């Protein structure tokens, strides 16, 4: 049979720093997420299921495929991971009562999720609809077992970098093998008349021309992301080595934005090299191209200009 009601509280979410990740957003690994649990051998049995939802979670930051319930060395249940990634705007746990060698009557416990959330990161539906999960500040993070809700508050930074200039994010999709990458041109308050926006990827790093996005989106969220994706007039190239978007008239209040899944698989890091053109209306052209070394996990530690770690 499958219960319900065995996540009971929300104890604690919080951030842990680390020496390459410094602002506290909701996409920075890693937030830890302490639950309460409870479970009472009268009503669970071996094998029941239980599920639970955890809305606006991008992915656990784990390589585990489970995490169980325990308490004073027992594991009264085994629950496997199902990260949201870009399949789904949740993410959430499938769990099973584990059968054990001493009987017990109600036991309860805490067990901690190590995630982090989706506030967006490129034009796909999941990010966009994500993209609108939480604002800078306080906001109530609830997770949802059964028709149960359970809550915390939790405060997130804002991003750091201003709005009004150009934006990058990579985001490491684990189950994928890829990472998305996402590259916003900076504002042009008026509209543009044209400009030309992409990457060229080296050092290890290919694009992955079957999962791209390229769209306007009307305005950015709180961490710079895009939070919809109009049509609008532009040519395309995708090679695995490049992606080259030229575009003519956005209108005003509107930012044009590309991105793509990248492969980088034995590597420490890659390169990007943005072209970054535009043209404000009534305005000159302005050729901007500059370079980031993304790298996945750091190793250097923490440094700066033109170095920037994927989350």
Not at 47 to 64: A, M
Not at 111 to 121: A, S
Not at 167 to 185: A, D, E, G, Q
Request: hydrophobic share 35%; net charge negative.
């Amino acid at each position: 049979k499958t219960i319900t009601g065995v996540f009971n509280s929300f104890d604690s979410l919080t951030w842990t720093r680390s020496v390459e990740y410094v602002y506290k957003g909701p996409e920075t690994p890693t937030w830890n997420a302490v639950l309460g649990w409870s479970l009472n051998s009268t009503t669970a049995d071996p094998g029941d299921t239980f599920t639970l939802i955890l809305p606006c979670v991008f992915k656990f930051i784990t390589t585990q495929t489970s995490v169980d319930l325990t308490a004073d060395g027992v594991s009264y249940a085994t629950c496997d991971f199902n990260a949201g990634e870009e399949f789904t705007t949740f993410s959430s746990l499938s769990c099973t009562v584990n059968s054990v060698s001493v009987s017990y009557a109600r036991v309860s416990g805490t067990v901690k999720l190590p995630i982090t959330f989706n506030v967006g990161g490129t034009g796909s539906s999941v990010d966009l609809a994500d993209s609108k999960c939480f604002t800078a500040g306080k906001n109530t993070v609830t997770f949802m077992d059964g028709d149960t809700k359970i809550s915390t508050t939790v405060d997130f930074d804002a991003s750091p970098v201003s709005p009004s200039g150009y934006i990058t994010s990579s985001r490491i999709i684990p189950s994928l093998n890829k990472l998305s990458s996402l590259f916003v041109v900076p504002q042009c308050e008026n509209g543009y008349t044209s400009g030309i926006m992409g990457f060229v990827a080296s050092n290890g790093a290919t694009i992955d021309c079957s999962n791209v996005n390229i769209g306007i989106s009307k305005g950015l969220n709180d961490w710079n992301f895009p939070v919809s994706s109009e049509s609008f007039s532009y040519t395309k190239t995708c090679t695995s080595t490049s992606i080259t978007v030229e575009f003519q008239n956005v209108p005003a209040g509107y930012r044009p934005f590309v991105d793509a899944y990248i492969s980088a698989e034995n590597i420490d890091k890659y390169t990007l090299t943005y072209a970054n053109e535009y043209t404000c209306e009534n305005g000159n052209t302005v050729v901007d191209p500059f370079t980031l070394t993304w790298w996945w996990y750091k190793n250097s530690e923490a440094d700066s200009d033109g170095d920037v770690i994927v989350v």
